[PDB]
Nucleic acid binder design. Structure first.
Ligand SMILES: Cc1cn([C@H]2C[C@H](O)[C@@H](COP(=O)(O)NP(=O)(O)OP(=O)(O)O)O2)c(=O)[nH]c1=O
Ligand SMILES: [Mg+2]
Ligand SMILES: [Mg+2]
Length: 430
DNA sequence: ATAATGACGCT
DNA sequence: AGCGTCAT
């Protein structure tokens, strides 16, 4: 009762760029704007595998992982841009640099956690505090929230999207407890005002559109972000959670998209996140373990405590290439030459990293996959990273895997290698 | 025959 | 240390 802790302590946003790789290519090539288009890599195999799809092309059913030859059958006017290739592999530099543009702008507003190349969580608790003080006690106008959705509103006794959005925003703002700087709903509202400002800044200064979720934790902010894509932001209040989760499939919640989520569904005999509330914490801990049990108990009530970590820089820098099917590497010099390609890209990226960020990696991780073997990595081995020298790194990486070579013949490699992966890790102040 | 990456848990 | 899960 007077002591129940309701997970309303923070204001957290998740900002995610809309069809990001497509937007980067579309800013550079105006002929691609506002058309169905996709970004692909490796043109030689069925037109390339699609890794990003504009919303106009999604309306025809084009999805990521589709072959471009197959996507053209769904969308004959689909326009393509292809990832740069360097040293015989995909080169994502252009998108990393675009990502840096966005991240630096978000960093001006608050502490951000870089979560992927195109999204970052934002901890707005302090910033909300400040703006509440600066704003006398004056109402929050709907004009401050021109792209915001209030999830679950409108309710109670218009046929177009923007009309619904406004009605719900009006209902929310009409109900707001403005003379109450402690109310979690007021805090989220002010957080949403700031995220409008952050997204306007991103669009003005980069040309890129994005969406955002605003809620009290990372999981809800990420869920909310996807509710009204593209180019829109969604506020998910604590109060919206029971109805939102009542028909929310379990797999849609961050970290439940895989085997854990599948076992939650099968073991408990449930479909929706809200049905989790019927189980005691001990019961959930008995099926899924102490931390997963506790996490599920709180999460299905809308409560989650994972912090927004102050980290804008990756912890690792890695290069990898697949060699599927008959292209699997089978001679030792083939293995050596690719390791050298990977090491040369890694040297470039590390040197830049050291200049910009004043740190050095100190460990090199070599990972390979074998023909027939099932998993992402078949095998990982590590060694010291003492010099950003591509030839040393590729030689060292070879040294530590070369006795994986089951092959008798002096010049062959068996089993064939279907993946090579070099990763620099364990950064330290430089 | 998606691919290329990245964060982190378990042991 | 080396492996497994989950994600974009
Ligand atoms: C999912 C996914 C995305 N990406 C690259 C390009 C995507 O544009 C960049 C950002 O990912 P996202 O936010 O999951 N997808 P999106 O930005 O293209 O589209 P949306 O507007 O966010 O739904 O992901 C991959 O390279 N492999 C992937 O598996
Ligand atoms: Mg995105
Ligand atoms: Mg994303």
């Amino acid at each position: 009762g007077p002591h129940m802790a309701t997970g309303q302590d923070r204001v957290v946003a998740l900002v995610d760029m809309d069809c990001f790789f497509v937007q980067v290519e579309q800013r550079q090539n105006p002929h691609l704007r506002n058309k169905p288009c996709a970004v692909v890599q490796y043109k030689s195999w069925k037109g390339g595998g699609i890794i990003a799809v504009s919303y106009e092309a999604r309306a025809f059913g084009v999805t990521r992982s589709m072959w471009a030859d197959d996507a053209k059958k769904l969308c004959p006017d689909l326009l393509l841009a292809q990832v740069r290739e360097s040293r015989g592999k995909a080169n994502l530099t252009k998108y990393r640099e675009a990502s840096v543009e966005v991240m630096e702008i978000m960093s001006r507003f608050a502490v951000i956690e870089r979560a992927s190349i195109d999204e970052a969580y934002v901890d707005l608790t302090s910033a909300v505090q400040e703006r509440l003080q600066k704003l006398q006690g004056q109402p929050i106008s709907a004009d401050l929230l021109p792209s915001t959705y209030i999830e679950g509103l409108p309710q109670g006794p218009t046929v177009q999207k923007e009309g619904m959005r406004k009605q719900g925003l009006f209902q929310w703002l009409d109900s707001l407890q403005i003379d109450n700087l402690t109310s979690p709903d007021l805090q989220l509202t002010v957080g949403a005002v700031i995220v409008e400002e952050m997204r306007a800044a991103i669009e003005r200064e980069t040309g890129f559109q994005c969406s955002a979720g605003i809620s009290h934790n990372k999981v809800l902010a990420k869920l909310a972000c996807g509710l009204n894509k593209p180019n829109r932001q969604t506020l998910v209040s604590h109060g919206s959670v029971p109805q939102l989760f009542s028909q929310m499939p379990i797999r849609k919640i961050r970290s439940l998209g895989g085997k854990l989520g599948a076992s939650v569904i099968e073991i408990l005999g449930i479909e929706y996140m809200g049905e989790l509330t019927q189980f005691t914490e001990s019961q959930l801990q008995s099926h899924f373990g102490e931390k997963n049990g506790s996490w599920l108990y709180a999460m299905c009530r809308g409560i989650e405590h994972d912090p927004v970590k102050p980290r804008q820089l990756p912890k690792t820098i890695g290069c990898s290439k697949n060699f599927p099917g008959k292209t699997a590497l089978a001679t030792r010099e083939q293995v050596q030459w690719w390791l050298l390609q990977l090491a040369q890209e890694l040297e470039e990226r590390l040197t830049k990293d050291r200049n910009d960020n004043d740190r050095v990696a100190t460990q090199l991780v070599v990972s390979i996959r074998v023909q027939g073997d099932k998993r992402l990595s078949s095998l990982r081995r590590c060694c010291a990273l003492t010099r950003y020298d591509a030839h040393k790194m590729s030689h060292d990486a070879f040294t530590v895997i070369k006795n994986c070579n089951t092959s008798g013949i002096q010049t062959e490699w068996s089993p064939p290698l279907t993946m090579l992966f070099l990763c620099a890790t364990k950064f330290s102040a430089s």
